[PDB]
Structures are given as structure tokens and as C-alpha cells.
Design a protein around this ligand. Structure first.
Ligand SMILES: COc1cc2nccc(Oc3ccc4c(C(=O)Nc5ccc(Cl)cc5)cccc4c3)c2cc1OC
Length: 292
């Protein structure tokens, strides 16, 4: 809010956008796919995702969208956080926040679809697994999302709703943190106290990890989200390891779900750790590939 808006640098002409098919419609607005012309110095007509208010919006929902915009401008650029490309804010038309487009969509659905196209790792002839998901992909995504969460935290930013559904997938397996029951991702303190901290996000990153290594499964399978659910969560109970997880990964999930927020790792530690797990898997994969 107090944050400024440099229209010289961000404002984009409305008539330079051809709004396409709706991608998703929420309770405050909607995201729409679109073509933008001259959005960036390079290409001529780039596909983008535009977030605008839905017909008949409370003067406040407006300001909310504007704040999201300034926040994005404040946050800055990072490969692992959906990139802000422009914005239509001056009078004349509806308020619109423009970002890059990620053709593969949300990570959860994406993973869910690769369940018949997965192999721990690849060996020759590797064309048997063309476009296949592997542990390296699964670990890579976790690495990326952590680097983006490290970035966000380093800017006093608290996501509040970190989950696979808020992760978009682009070309070359590059994931991006974005933001469109949620109790299944909420930390105990967030549920019983309404307290959102950076560490409450680490808890959620824990739930995200489980999603990633269950290839898009829904957390707490079977469990009904009720008093008992919350009671058990508070008391220590935790999800079992997902079908595609590794020993080290699952443990990180437990670490993330620690009861004391202060005892949970930090995103910086998580980046440091996953990078390592990513490295080991690689070396391992290299020997697997080399002998077979
Ligand atoms: C599957 O096809 C799709 C591809 C997509 N590719 C990119 C963006 C999409 O929708 C989005 C997702 C997030 C945002 C944010 C935004 O993420 N703001 C934000 C960022 C960080 C923080 Cl902390 C707070 C708010 C700001 C403005 C517009 C947005 C549009 C897509 C939607 C799709 O439909 C489902």
C-alpha cells in the first residue's frame, strides 16, 4: 500500500492486449490468457497471464489487486517466482496485472499426469524414457521452490498459502511460485493461533514436498478435516512417506513439520540441503548410467 507505483516502468497499453480464454476464475477476480504486443523489448507478440477484477468489484478489492501489484514490484525478480511483466492501472479500462505465461500450469495437476511416465533415473537406451519424470526432476523442483522461498523470505515476505497448486511449470522444467481446504497446508500455530510466520511457510513447504513426491497426491489421504485432524496435528501425528520419496527427502518433510516453528529448518538451510541431495542423486545417476 505505502509502496509506490512507477508507471513509467510498468504501465502497459490496454489496446496492446488481446484477452483470450479465461484460465481460472476466483472469488475476487479471474486470470485470463492473452497476447501482449511489445510487452518486452525482445519478442513481438508474447502470450501472458492477466489478473483482473471480475465484473462488479468492491472499491477495496481494487486496492487489494493494486497492493498485490506493488508487492510484486517490491519483491523484485527471481527465476523461481512468477515474473511480473506489466500492468494497466491508469484510467480508461479495468485494472490488470500482467505476468509471464507458464504453459504447463499448476505443478500438482502436472505431476498427477506423469504417473505413468516416471522412472527413478535413466540409463541407455534413454529414449525409452523420453519426457519422463525422474527423482532428479522431483528434487530439482523442490530445489527451485526453496530458492524462490528463500528469496521471498529475504524480503520479509510471507506466502501464507504455499502449495503445489500455487506452483506453475514452464519450459525446461522451471517452476515458479505464484499465488491465485487450505487447513491441510497450514501449520499448527497458524490453525490454533492465526499466526502466519516465515516458519509457518516452511511447514507448508513440507506439505508441498509430500505433494511433489506423491506425484500430485492430495495430502492426508482419507482423513476428514475435523477437530480430530487438528487435534492430532497439534499432538504430533504426521503423514507417512509418499510413494516416490527418498529416505533423505521424507526426513526433510518431518524436519519441516516440526512442532516448534523455531526448530524447523530455514529456507536457506533447505536450499543448502536440497542442492546437496540434488548433487548426490546426480552422481548416483552417473554411475547407474555408466555401468548400464
Ligand atoms: C494452467 O494455465 C495457466 C498458466 C498460468 N501462467 C501464469 C500465471 C497464471 O495465473 C496467475 C497466477 C498468479 C498471478 C499473480 C501472483 O502470483 N501474485 C503474487 C505473487 C507472489 C506473492 Cl507473495 C503474492 C501474489 C499475479 C498476477 C497474475 C497471476 C496470474 C496462469 C494461470 C493458468 O491457469 C490455471
Amino acid at each position: 500500500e505505502r509502496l509506490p507505483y512507477d508507471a513509467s516502468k510498468w504501465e502497459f497499453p490496454r489496446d496492446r492486449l488481446k484477452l483470450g480464454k479465461p484460465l481460472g476464475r476466483g472469488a475476487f477476480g479471474q486470470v485470463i490468457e492473452a497476447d501482449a504486443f511489445g510487452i518486452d523489448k525482445t519478442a513481438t507478440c508474447r502470450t501472458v497471464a492477466v489478473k483482473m477484477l471480475k465484473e462488479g468489484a468492491t472499491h477495496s478489492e481494487h486496492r487489494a489487486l493494486m497492493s498485490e501489484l506493488k508487492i510484486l514490484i517490491h519483491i523484485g525478480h527471481h527465476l523461481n517466482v512468477v515474473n511480473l511483466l506489466g500492468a494497466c492501472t491508469k484510467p480508461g479500462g479495468p485494472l490488470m496485472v500482467i505476468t509471464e505465461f507458464c504453459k504447463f500450469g499448476n505443478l500438482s495437476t502436472y505431476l498427477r499426469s506423469k504417473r505413468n511416465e516416471f522412472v527413478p533415473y535413466k540409463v541407455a537406451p534413454e529414449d525409452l524414457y523420453k519426457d519422463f519424470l525422474t527423482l532428479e526432476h522431483l528434487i530439482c523442483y523442490s530445489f527451485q521452490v526453496a530458492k524462490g522461498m528463500e528469496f521471498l523470505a529475504s524480503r520479509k515476505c510471507i506466502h501464507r498459502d504455499l502449495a503445489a497448486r500455487n506452483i506453475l511449470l514452464s519450459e525446461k522444467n522451471v517452476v515458479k511460485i505464484c499465488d491465485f481446504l487450505p487447513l491441510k497446508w497450514m501449520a499448527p500455530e497458524t490453525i490454533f493461533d492465526r499466526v502466519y510466520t516465515i516458519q509457518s511457510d516452511v511447514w507448508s513447504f513440507g506439505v508441498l514436498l509430500w505433494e511433489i513426491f506423491s506425484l500430485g497426491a492430495s495430502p492426508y489421504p482419507g482423513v476428514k478435516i475435523d477437530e480430530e485432524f487438528c487435534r492430532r496435528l497439534k499432538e504430533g501425528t504426521r503423514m507417512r512417506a509418499p510413494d516416490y520419496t527418498t529416505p533423505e527427502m521424507y526426513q526433510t518433510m518431518l524436519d519441516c513439520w516440526h512442532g516448534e516453528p523455531s526448530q524447523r529448518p530455514t529456507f536457506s538451510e533447505l536450499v543448502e540441503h536440497l542442492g546437496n541431495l540434488l548433487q548426490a542423486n546426480a552422481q548416483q545417476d552417473r554411475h547407474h548410467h555408466h555401468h548400464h
